[PDB]
Assembly symmetry: D2
Homo-oligomer: 223 residues x 4
């Protein structure tokens, strides 16, 4: 199967809406109560570093309380050395959107050497119709208002960055990454079933057959 | 054929730094004092406001050479390009080692907080450098470096960054880029024929047939 | 007198509203027609680099045309080696504000050495009541909506960054800087007399006596 | 007295790396293999989500030592602080040369596009380094370096960055900082007594009377 590490925001009544950390499985390793705010723009902050070896997420809304979750995990023992990073989304049977307004990533590998740092950094504040640097999978598309629509507008969409990412290296004193993305989940229904995730996977990851709904387009089965 | 814009350093039959817009017949050149066995540093910069491409090549103890050319890249290059390093050796024993490479591109829209940006920094190449497309005799890992031409007689190598780059956009108020790379040209011969270039091209550019020597692996012929 | 280099936006009918470059004097070295948009947030982009030796400014408004001005000048021969950078504003006799919504600066000195770069970078997207890292002069204050009010709310205000800035160095192959700031000029009058400027001066620069109005708080006299 | 948080490397009467929260009696320490005459690299990091301070010291060929401490800096440090480097030599001949220093602070608000940040990078100090406050025996320019203790018997030197730093804000969703510095401790004695520290303090901190040796110039006494 693909190898997945993902921080997901989900309202699927499996059972309150929550933010969760997933290490190779949809049955989250850790979750926190999340107050999904329909129609309001949210902001997810994800961070990791090899020294602490702890993956942390923070989701907040303006004038708001924030939800936060952290999980101690050494990504070196989970993920391959080279990965692709991306955004996922799955809609239950409700009318709703999963608009990503902006996305940014930064990765750094600092060696044992003097002045040896390797780094990648992309910042999307405005997606275009032909966003060549992104691999779009599922129902995802770009250009709609200069945004990225992950889900159809039971839909599943995804968008991974083109260039593979060097997440870890056996000779680095401190590897690290940090991702930030602003989303807008709008639904006419009062209690919609929806989910987005920032995930890290093998370079050639693709939508598993039947990864719909609570499987977020990341996993082929919970069982 | 391909579309090429490149800043080249060449000693072929006099050593000079030069700007090439779609042709090997440089649009502008400057006298260059090629220092055998010494690490050099090329700084290339451009911005849509000034609309002027500029390069600076210096060696420690410092002989710096610099060349600028007024050109609106919007009318030359496609919207999406791949960036890279090229090198061709004449009939001499020599190396074209790249010790570090870094790039930074930015698109600032008319909107407020409009910025789109990409940035990579290689200070240590690895044997499996998945984020680089190697063409020709180029390879990586040798000392954690990038060897453009084969290390030991008419050799051509190239290395382009994986992710396409959004170099211009009709709705940007200022687009800009900046590249920096440190090279080491070592040759036992007193007056070796050699050349490196930082070039920008269409995403699917490849080594033209017969682009050896003076043609730097960029051009298929001297027109 | 103080040493001033500034990019100013002014509507004082000395005579249309314009954007201008000032090198040690209020009688601009170069100016461009500017369409001052009352009540709308604007964005000034200022850039310079020692290779091109050309100072450029771009002012745009959303859904807009942009005004732009560039001036060839070697700052090394104008400014001291160490300077403080800041924002200025002067109101004529009209009711109006000169709110700065965000400010950011970046300076870099790249030496002849391999991996020798020196750099400073600040980004203000939200000013607080006690903004200790800014020196406020005149009527300027902070905290009002998490913004900086340059002018009283015939007022003159200014705000310079605390840390002195190393703009140039005789041993740098390329010195450079870039500043961006978003302003909101609101006035009930149809044709108000106002002016803001991003200026660079000696570390101990202060408001000259009688620098009001068309002198932007930068110069003590035009004559 | 002053308020100090510091990550110190000390060999006094055993060499270890340690975290100090308001007292020389380190809260946590790790065995350190001080390599005389070899350039070392300290990486210090913190973030308000994890609320854990972490350090990593490594030498090329690589013995890395690392220490972390769970602490909420919001309850220890004032809101505005100055950051710096300290050093104290015992009765031995030795130097505490800092080859490069860099810092990065960020305050991300609850708002959208909320970020506030400061960042400096010194890779080459000059004789008149106006943006640094030197205290004690510290000086700059010697080889384009920073000599914390006097170069040739009980010497204490310190260098703090000029601009105050906004390290925390009650309305931030994630505050964070990161510091990196390369040092060179050269001593003719086989087992020299010495110590350097990266510390954070109140803006007006100065060398306490009698802060020599084990007290690193940070503390006036061992309590
Ligand atoms: Co779940
Ligand atoms: Co030529
Ligand atoms: Co004027
Ligand atoms: Co101790």
């Amino acid at each position: 199967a693909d190898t997945i590490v993902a921080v997901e925001l989900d309202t699927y009544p499996n059972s309150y809406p929550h933010i969760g950390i997933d290490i190779k499985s949809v049955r989250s390793k850790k979750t926190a109560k999340w107050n999904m705010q329909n129609g309001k723009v949210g902001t997810a902050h994800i961070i990791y570093n090899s020294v602490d070896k702890r993956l942390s997420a923070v989701v907040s809304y303006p004038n708001a309380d924030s939800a936060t979750v952290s999980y101690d995990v050494d990504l070196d023992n989970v993920l391959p050395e080279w990965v692709r990073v991306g955004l996922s989304a799955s809609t239950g049977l409700y009318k709703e959107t999963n608009t990503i307004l902006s996305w940014s990533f930064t990765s750094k590998l600092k060696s044992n050497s003097t002045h040896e740092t390797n780094a990648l950094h992309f910042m999307f504040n405005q997606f275009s119709k032909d966003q060549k640097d992104l691999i779009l999978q599922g129902d995802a598309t770009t250009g709609t208002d200069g945004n990225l629509e992950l889900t159809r507008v039971s839909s599943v969409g995804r968008a991974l960055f083109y260039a593979p990412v060097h997440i870890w290296e056996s000779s680095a004193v401190v590897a690290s990454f940090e991702a930030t993305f602003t989303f807008l989940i709008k639904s006419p229904d009062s209690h919609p079933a929806d989910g987005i995730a920032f995930f890290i996977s093998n370079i050639d990851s693709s939508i598993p057959s039947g990864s719909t709904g609570r499987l977020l387009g990341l996993f082929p089965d919970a069982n």
